[model samples]
Target: HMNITDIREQFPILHQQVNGHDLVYLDSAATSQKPRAVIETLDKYYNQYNSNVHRGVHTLGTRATDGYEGAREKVRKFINAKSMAEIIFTKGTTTSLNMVALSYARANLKPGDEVVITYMEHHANIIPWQQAVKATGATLKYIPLQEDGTISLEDVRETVTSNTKIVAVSHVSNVLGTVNPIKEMAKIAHDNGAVIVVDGAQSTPHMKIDVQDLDCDFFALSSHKMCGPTGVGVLYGKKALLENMEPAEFGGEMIDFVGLYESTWKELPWKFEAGTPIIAGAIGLGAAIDFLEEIGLDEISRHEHKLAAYALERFRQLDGVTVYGPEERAGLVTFNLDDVHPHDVATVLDAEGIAVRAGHHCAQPLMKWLDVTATARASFYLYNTEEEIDKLVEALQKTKEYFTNVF
Candidate 1:
């Protein structure tokens, strides 16, 4: 249904060479490359109508406001949210999660209440809950990962009880590429009288999401991981919950009425968004949504699955390479070559113009669970092809040979 050559041509950055070879970008897990449509939307905003949102009466101001608010509507439709008022934009997923922890959890939690999470979470998701529990006297618990780097529902049931106030987990593991069953997890959390919060930073870019179907109380995602710019993310919460929770930050735009003795905050999403907003970034995200919709998320997902399968099959030919995670992965292969540091592996790949990530990947607890210091990851996206993966396999074989011979 989709044309790979046509899709590849839309990304201007992919046309150039890195070092002596064509660039093989396999790091979509960190950040996705922008399509020209998103880039052009950003350019049009800055070049034509550059003005602050919600506070202007001029033509530029009205146009900017339309762009900003239109992006919210697009996000609501993209995720199948109930309303645009439920979508609050922030700096990124870190800020969105922190807003939930600091504003909602800290206010609602008390002594003896528990906040459950998994060891596979990124530092952004982990530390915020740590601070929230520390501040509110609530206990923090972790659902242990299985041998294949996936969580068991039985473990989740055992961990989450009536004492649990919030159960936060990632929809998909960034390091392992393992996809979690969010709808089932949300049902479990709800049955226990706890709200589930999903870290959707990785999942939103690759799969179709329906907040109503998942029934998650809170969802956080970053636009940069979905072919949009950085400095823009969305936090979707149930309308009733958001209405009850107090604003995380107080400043100019979030105020309804301020006095020396009393101050009232604005309604819903605006109360969460303080001061000036990221107008151009939000507009660019809207354009990205348009671009991705045209190509279809289902198509992109299938393409990545095929690529992951091919990469895994090719990896079987290599000796002493240990791959992490389950066979049913999303779009990445995290592995390590025996007798070589992950940094060395990444360096060798970089020489061939293949970009891969090498480090703890912000999941130090997961690294500890895997009994490794770090690992190498090559992630795929819609624009990637089988030929590029063949190139990666050839380069990796050369790397193993070079390292073994040198030693």
Candidate 2:
């Protein structure tokens, strides 16, 4: 069991006020607020043992190297990966997804091959497969989203055929907050002679993940979305698959042997991580993993679900407010007011020291599926409270009245 109050105390930034009111941050889906531990880890690294890793002979070099590589091991255990070799660090979720697209999808997908995704994918998950299929003369297909913003395995079955080379999907939708059935979907993809790739940027922070249980070929997530520093993302591929794929990038750190004519790549993961890596960011991410583990992922998920349910119940009682997605979702509520633009809603919320995200949320295809230009989203995390939801509800009522008077 976790104490919400104690958990809230761990994040220092939550204590501040904004716009003459206590801050109510509801934008964890966009980027999570880092805890003091994670921030201090970065501070300590730069202040104490800052050095280039893997090359220098000095003590700081060895410590930096250990910290950087140890972060990889932390990630491996976090997702229940077989080895650290399966985990390759990258810039962020976008870069990690692109790596699979370029190094794996581009290589395997040929003419007549098909890549299947859904309408709810973030642009990071969509465009890479788009370019991959385009390059190989392969076709791109979409799994239709259900009316309630969920995907049915029936649709998955219909959309994915033997010709489907890759099935790319988000484990949790950034816009809808719908958690997709990844383990089941992975089975379907495997049955059809396809590999399943999961965009885990949304799922990883909010829930416990086990790649071995899900059995996905590729999974990518961002550190910034999970209470860690930015500029660090993880790509977990099966060791066998990563070994067979060619490197998408090349430079100093990834080379095993360099001759006058050609060079050989290092190992499974190092070959994928080209150039000097995000050392400080990785260490911060490791600290974040430790922080989350102490709170317990199950406890965090439970807290968010209770908040989501309360939010849904309250929002449903509001007049002229339409909440998107299913009744059960993962810690987010995307909604719209009658004849009010999402941008206006976000502005009013901001004035009240309530931060929320508005717009396509980098899911233009999902926006199209929702049949709207944009939507306002208030996403919850461990630090959020029911009192904050009350503030948001009251602020929304004020926004509607203020707008109605202006009109």
Candidate 3:
């Protein structure tokens, strides 16, 4: 059990009012609120030892180098990778996934090669592969979603073939809350001579992830979604695969030697980092990792799960609201209120001091698959309580009545 009351105090943003009402942040999926510690770390870096990394000889330069590299070590441990070389810093999960699509998949995939993904993946995960297929003359295949919004081995057995060079899927659906079995899918890919890529954007923050144990060749995650600063993400690629691939971007600090006609690249992780990196973002992320570990990631996830369960039950009790996804969902409850558009419903709720997301959530293919235009989602995090869900249910009822009155 977690002392959530004490946990709430750690997040300075939670101790405020929004629209004259106490804030109930339910958008952790979009980006989590940073704790005081993470923000303070950022302030400390900019105010104190802010300097360029890797090549500076000054004391401040050494401090910056230590801070940046130290953050990489923390990220490596966070995902339980085999080595720090397996971790590469990128702009976010989008860049991380693109690194695979453009760099690795570009070399591995050919005209007849296949890349398998699911319908529920975010646009970040989908578009890169689409571009890869266009560039490489490869084929893009989708793993069909089951009736309950989950996927199974049967889907994998049917979709993945020997020509499948890559099997990429989101570990947890941001829209559907379906937790896909990557390990099971990974075995299928390996059987067919394909390596697996796990989009850990949703899973890493919510659950314990061990890339070595899962044996996935690539894993991608974002810092902003995990109580850290934006502009930072991780791409965990197997050393063997990364060594075989070329760097997607090139410039200073990523090369061992340069010449007029030839150049030598730096070692594993550094090769992926191009130009001047996001200094403050990496330092902030390191602090976030420390903060989450101190309180325990399991406790944070359990707290969110409880909130989601409560939100689901509360939403189901209504006469006309229709909830999407399985009863056992992640972080939030996504749903539609009667015949109203999700945007309209979200607007009404906002007036009542409740913040909810309303859109396709960057999964247009999923929107079509689910047979809806858009849906509203009230996502939860560690600081959220059942009392907030009670507010949400009450506000939703008012939103329903308001729509009825307007119609």
Flag clash pairs in model 2: none
Give the 10-residue window scoring lowest on summed lDDT in candidate 2.
1-10
- Report lDDT (Cα) of residue 303, candidate 1: 91
lDDT of 1: 0.93
What would the per-residue lDDT of candidate 1 be over residues 1-407, giving only the tens digit for each residue?
Answer: 78999999999989878888999999999999999999999999999998998646789999999999999999999999999889999999999999999889999899999999998999988999999999998999999989999999999999999999999999999999999978999999999999999999999999999999999999999999999998999999999999999999889889999999889999878989899898999999999999999999999999989999999999988888999999998999999999989998898898899999999999999999999999999998888999999998898889889988998
Against the hidden reference, what TM-scores do the models get? 0.99, 0.98, 0.98
9: Cα error in model 2, Å = 1.6
lDDT for residue 104 in candidate 3, whole number 0-100: 87
lDDT of 2 by residue, 283-323 (tens): 99999999999889999999999999999998987899999
Model 2 scores a TM of 0.98
**Candidate 1 ranges beyond 4 A from true positions:** none
Instruction: Report the alpha-carbon TM-score of model 3 versus the true structure.
Output: 0.98
Model 3, span 43-101: residue lDDT tens: 99999999999646999999999999999899889888878888898999999999999
List, in order, the clash count of every candidate structure.
0, 0, 0
